[PDB]
Amino acid sequence: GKTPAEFAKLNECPLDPGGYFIVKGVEKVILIQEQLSKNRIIVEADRKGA
Protein backbone atom coordinates (compact mmCIF):
# COMPACT_ATOMS: atom_id res chain seq x y z
CA GLY A 1 0.00 0.00 0.00
CA LYS A 2 2.91 2.42 -0.30
CA THR A 3 3.68 5.07 -2.96
CA PRO A 4 7.01 4.96 -4.89
CA ALA A 5 8.33 8.00 -3.01
CA GLU A 6 7.75 6.17 0.30
CA PHE A 7 9.82 3.16 -0.75
CA ALA A 8 12.74 5.60 -0.65
CA LYS A 9 12.55 5.91 3.13
CA LEU A 10 12.73 2.12 3.49
CA ASN A 11 15.58 1.54 0.97
CA GLU A 12 13.45 -0.69 -1.27
CA CYS A 13 12.76 -0.90 -4.99
CA PRO A 14 9.30 -0.25 -6.46
CA LEU A 15 9.96 -3.11 -8.89
CA ASP A 16 11.30 -5.71 -6.43
CA PRO A 17 8.49 -8.30 -6.70
CA GLY A 18 8.47 -9.89 -3.31
CA GLY A 19 7.30 -13.36 -2.48
CA TYR A 20 10.58 -14.16 -0.73
CA PHE A 21 11.49 -14.42 2.94
CA ILE A 22 14.39 -12.92 4.88
CA VAL A 23 15.96 -15.36 7.34
CA LYS A 24 19.30 -14.52 9.04
CA GLY A 25 20.14 -11.99 6.34
CA VAL A 26 19.71 -14.02 3.13
CA GLU A 27 16.73 -14.05 0.80
CA LYS A 28 15.06 -17.47 0.57
CA VAL A 29 12.22 -18.51 -1.74
CA ILE A 30 9.82 -21.35 -1.03
CA LEU A 31 9.52 -22.82 -4.51
CA ILE A 32 6.37 -24.13 -6.16
CA GLN A 33 6.18 -27.91 -5.86
CA GLU A 34 4.49 -30.25 -8.34
CA GLN A 35 2.60 -33.20 -6.88
CA LEU A 36 0.08 -35.73 -8.10
CA SER A 37 -3.54 -35.27 -7.12
CA LYS A 38 -4.72 -37.11 -4.05
CA ASN A 39 -7.94 -39.17 -3.85
CA ARG A 40 -7.89 -40.31 -7.47
CA ILE A 41 -7.98 -43.78 -9.03
CA ILE A 42 -4.77 -44.33 -11.00
CA VAL A 43 -5.20 -47.30 -13.34
CA GLU A 44 -1.69 -48.31 -14.34
CA ALA A 45 0.48 -51.19 -15.46
CA ASP A 46 2.82 -53.15 -13.21
CA ARG A 47 6.47 -53.96 -13.96
CA LYS A 48 5.54 -57.52 -14.96
CA GLY A 49 2.80 -56.41 -17.38
CA ALA A 50 -0.33 -56.78 -15.25
Partner 1 sequence: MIIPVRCFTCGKIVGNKWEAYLGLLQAEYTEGDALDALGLKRYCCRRMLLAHVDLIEKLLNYAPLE
Partner 2 sequence: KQAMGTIGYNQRNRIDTLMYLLAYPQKPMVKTKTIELIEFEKLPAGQNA
Applying CB under 8 A, which residues contact partner 2? 7, 11-16
Residues contributing to the annotated binding site for DNA: 47
Nearer to partner 2, 31 or 36 (CB): 31
- State in angstroms the smallest separation of the CB of 8 from partner 1: 5
- State in angstroms the smallest separation of the CB of 11 from partner 2: 5
Cα separation of 16 and 23, whole Å? Answer: 17
Give the 3-state secondary structure of the chain. CCCCCCCCCCCCCCCCCCCCEEECCEEECCCCCCCCCCCCCCCCCCCCCC
Binding residues vs partner 1 (CB under 8 A): 5, 8, 11
